[PDB]
Write a protein that binds this ligand. Structure first.
Ligand SMILES: CC(C)(COP(=O)(O)OP(=O)(O)OC[C@H]1O[C@@H](n2cnc3c(N)ncnc32)[C@H](O)[C@@H]1OP(=O)(O)O)[C@@H](O)C(=O)NCCC(=O)NCCS
Ligand SMILES: C=C(C)CC(=O)O[C@H]1C[C@@]2(COC(C)=O)[C@@H](C=C1C)O[C@@H]1[C@H](O)[C@@H](OC(C)=O)[C@@]2(C)[C@]12CO2
Length: 443
């Protein structure tokens, strides 16, 4: 038995209704290999569950009433995490290894309805509040010449850093490799106390842009992957580094690409709105380092940084000026104070319904980006004997205007950005020469 209160940050209403999906593609030389793939994977899930029982649990809310959004806990569910096995080898609507390779692994070929065990959003059958919310769900998809492994994580229970930590240990378990003491410790840290609260706190700048207000706001669209070569990435960082603000010593590769996207989106948006239009960049940031928490902590410990300007200013300023905006918010002391503030506000409020990481983001003019660039998914083989993933891609789901992801970085340095934009923005972006100089459309 177990009853593990979610991270206070994981009590965010938005996170409690969402599943984060990621797919790993492996080539499979011969269909003779599938039975052992499945048994190895099932045995791994069993071993993992025996070692860390809560991974087989579910997220369950209690104490809900009028003006009380309740408190969720990880509690028992089934003996092992659920894996679904789907054979798509003979399905003419399914992807194939050669189709994937020819098209460069587009998002459209990772259809969540076909290759994921549950949808990202609370849409359709089995996504109601009374329906179970398993902590993790897995799907093994056999495709012609390949295997797609998809992992869903309940977002209240884990951010992608936590999900990566869970998946990493699942790979060990599949191989029958032992967990380290530090791994076992990280997997079992108490969550409800992991962010120390602020004393006598009501409301401060810490929760700016995170509480919905009635006088503050916060279309045909699509998803597409764009790739950026290692050379494109280094040239973007070079361009930014040459043009930094005086207050900024350095920026990162991730900063530079993030800035380039904000600038490029803002540029194409000038074709439909005025340069004076406000624009907010919302950037997901792992709060573990600022909090002094292990990278192996499997929970939800994330915040955003917010950057407000105008469409014209962002479009027209140097790349370094834009990258400097992003880097300026990553001071550990600032991240810690802000994150403690958000956690404290949540803790102090039985009604959490007004709190949102994108509370004042306007989908028309904002960018909401989460970078998974630094997660370790490219390294896991799960004892399957297939080698490392050929690609690591997020499944396509409903378009969500201005939502964006960076995939885990390909070992050679290649980046893959998933962008969701309204059609007129997407079309203009794809035809924009300043964008296509660096960005290769995949789809
Ligand atoms: C916010 C976030 C995306 C920033 O990513 P990041 O810039 O790659 O990571 P960091 O802030 O740790 O910065 C490391 C970078 O700073 C650079 N840097 C650090 N010290 C430096 C110095 N002394 N001189 C020059 N560069 C330096 C590093 O070289 C590295 O840049 P690189 O990747 O181009 O080599 C990341 O911290 C994060 O939270 N990711 C997860 C987001 C999520 O959960 N979703
Ligand atoms: C459409 C949903 C109903 C709300 C939404 O935009 O969710 C995004 C953003 C986000 C969660 O959104 C909210 C409002 O909490 C998450 C997943 C999804 C589907 O991805 C990314 C990430 O996992 C979340 O951010 C965190 C956890 O800090 C998130 C903010 C994101 C863009 O950064």
């Amino acid at each position: 038995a177990f009853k593990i209160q979610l991270d206070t940050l994981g009590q965010l209403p938005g996170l409690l209704s969402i599943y984060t999906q990621i797919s790993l593609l492996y080539p499979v030389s011969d269909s003779s290999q599938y039975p052992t793939i499945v048994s190895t994977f099932e045995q791994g899930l069993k071993r993992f569950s025996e070692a860390v029982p809560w991974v087989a649990g579910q997220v369950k809310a209690e104490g809900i009433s009028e003006g009380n959004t309740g408190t969720s806990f990880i509690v028992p569910f089934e003996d092992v995490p659920r894996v679904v096995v789907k054979d798509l080898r003979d399905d003419p609507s399914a992807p194939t290894i050669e189709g994937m390779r020819k098209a460069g692994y587009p998002m459209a070929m990772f259809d969540e309805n076909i290759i994921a065990p549950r949808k990202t959003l609370p849409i359709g059958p089995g996504t109601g509040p009374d329906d179970p919310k398993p902590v993790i769900l897995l799907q093994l998809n056999f495709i012609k010449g390949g295997l797609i492994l998809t992992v869903n994580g309940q977002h209240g229970a884990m951010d992608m850093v936590g999900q990566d930590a869970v998946i990493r240990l699942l790979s060990k378990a599949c191989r029958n490799d032992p967990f380290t003491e530090e791994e076992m410790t990280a997997m079992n840290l108490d969550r409800k106390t992991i962010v120390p609260y602020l004393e006598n706190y009501t409301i401060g700048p810490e929760v700016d842009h995170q509480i919905v207000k009635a006088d503050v706001a916060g279309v045909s669209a699509s998803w597409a992957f764009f790739t950026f070569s290692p050379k494109a990435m280094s040239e973007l960082k070079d361009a930014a580094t040459k043009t930094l603000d005086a207050s900024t010593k350095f920026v990162s590769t991730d900063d530079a690409l993030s800035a380039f996207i904000w600038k490029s989106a803002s540029r194409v948006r000038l074709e439909r709105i005025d340069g004076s239009a406000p624009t907010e960049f919302c950037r997901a940031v792992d709060a573990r380092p600022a909090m002094g928490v292990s990278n192996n902590y499997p929970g939800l410990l994330q915040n955003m940084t917010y950057h407000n300007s105008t469409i014209g200013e962002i479009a027209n300023e140097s790349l370094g000026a834009t990258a400097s905006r992003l880097r300026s918010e990553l001071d550990p002391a600032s991240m810690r104070q802000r994150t403690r503030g958000l956690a404290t506000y949540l803790h102090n409020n039985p009604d959490k319904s007004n709190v949102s990481l994108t509370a004042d983001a306007d989908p028309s003019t904002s960018v909401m980006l989460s970078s998974w660039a630094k997660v370790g998914l490219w390294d896991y083989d799960f004892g399957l004997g297939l080698g490392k993933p050929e690609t690591v891609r997020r499944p396509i789901f409903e378009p969500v205007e201005s939502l964006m992801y960076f995939m885990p970085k390909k070992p050679d340095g290649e980046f893959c950005a998933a962008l969701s934009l309204r059609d007129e923005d997407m079309d203009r972006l794809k035809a924009d020469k300043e964008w296509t100089k660096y960005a290769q459309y995949v789809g």
